[PDB]
Amino acid sequence: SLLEFGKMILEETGKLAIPSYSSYGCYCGWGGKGTPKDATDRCCFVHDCCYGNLPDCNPKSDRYKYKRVNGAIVCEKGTSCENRICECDKAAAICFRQNLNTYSKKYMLYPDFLCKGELKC
Numbered sequence: 001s002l003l004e005f006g007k008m009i010l011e012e013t014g015k016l017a018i019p020s021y022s023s024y025g026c027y028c029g030w031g032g033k034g035t036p037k038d039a040t041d042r043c044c045f046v047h048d049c050c051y052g053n054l055p056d057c058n059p060k061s062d063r064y065k066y067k068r069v070n071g072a073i074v075c076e077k078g079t080s081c082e083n084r085i086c087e088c089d090k091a092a093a094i095c096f097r098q099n100l101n102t103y104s105k106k107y108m109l110y111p112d113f114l115c116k117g118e119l120k121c
């Protein structure tokens with residue numbers, strides 16, 4: 001669910017999901033198109049593609065369980081959807097951590113006309 005993705009992100013990066021990652025670039029937050037602006041935005045793009053592989057799952061509202069084995073994120077067993085949603089979110093959180101160095105404030109609240117492009121998952 002969206003509440004635990006928020007908490008996973010905070011734990012990984014030290015930044016609050018809202019607003020750091022809810023209006024970033026073209027795909028972080030609320031995103032539908034264009035070319036991802038930078039690495040962090042590519043993380044959001046991949047995250048969206050990952051959810052897109054689960055048409056009969058409800059990522060925003062379905063809750064999963066996970067634990068931290070010394071920093072490593074371990075998804076605990078639940079329903080097939082919960083397991084797969086959890087793996088999508090874990091990947092995104094790690095992707096965010098990996099690209100914190102290039103995170104840029106100029107992409108926050110990024111305008112929708114500047115999202116130009118095409119890209120396939």
Ligand SMILES: CC(=O)Nc1ccc(O)cc1
Nearest residue numbers: 002005006017018022029
């Ligand atoms: C803050 C937060 O949970 N953001 C978020 C979650 C899922 C998604 O596909 C894009 C963004």
